[PDB]
Symmetry: C2
Subunit: 145 residues, 2 copies
């Protein structure tokens, strides 16, 4: 197990299925995360991918036990992990423009949306996050407004 | 089906089912606490004050934390109180904590319990303390703010 932290729902951890990580709450698996370097992935074809650019895909299993704010706790765990690695300079994501739930999460974490791209299988938004705006969003979250 | 009460909290879905005088408490279908639930008039406590019609008390025991979860005691405690106040026969909650049990006193106070006086019950020195809906509801408003 690579990483752990505490949230309201319980203790979140990450263990390798490094490029595909299983995520658990209280030792129960509840999400999959794919973790890639931007340079070597499809997304690297649509912009000038830099050294330090990493992306992620995230899948959250359906909720038998429906727990408030669970998506935000997963998402923020994932980002906190990526930013715990000093080689990760910037997080790049390519959410499908229709996937409204992931855009809410992205924006809450300080992601900046650049422009849409057509990747053939989907139209995506290209969006970035660095530590500065992420840490500021964490401060927003702790101020409870 | 055997569930008498359920409510949602940050840690998950909380439920109560019979083990009604002994109830088991679960979070996301995992048992995590025992509550004994008695009418004050008929209990050892009734011998130390003028127990009224409407007076109910209880005892709460919380299992060891396999996974420690933020604010869990308060979510359990508060579920227990919300449950007691969901019963229209319960006019007043009466508690008799040991004067040394500092953890339960924080919980009681945070839910708007008013401490009356100490009582030597033989096996312990306890505080007698009451809660009615008015001050509990106000404590719930406090929690929902910050």
């Amino acid at each position: 197990t690579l990483y752990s932290t505490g949230r309201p729902a319980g203790r979140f951890t990450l263990r390798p299925m490094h490029a595909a990580l299983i995520g658990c709450c209280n030792d129960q698996p509840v999400f999959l995360m794919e973790f890639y370097k931007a340079s070597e992935d499809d997304i690297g074809k649509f912009y000038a991918a830099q050294p330090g650019d990493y992306g992620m895909h995230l899948l959250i299993a359906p909720a038998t036990h429906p727990v408030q704010q669970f998506s935000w706790q997963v998402f923020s765990t994932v980002i906190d992990f990526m930013f715990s690695l000093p080689e990760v300079k910037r997080v790049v994501v390519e959410p499908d423009e229709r996937n409204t739930k992931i855009h809410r999460l992205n924006k809450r974490a300080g992601f900046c949306y650049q422009h849409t791209i057509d990747m053939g299988h989907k139209t995506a938004w290209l969006a970035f996050c660095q530590r500065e705006n992420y840490q500021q969003a964490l401060l927003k979250e702790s101020l409870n407004m």
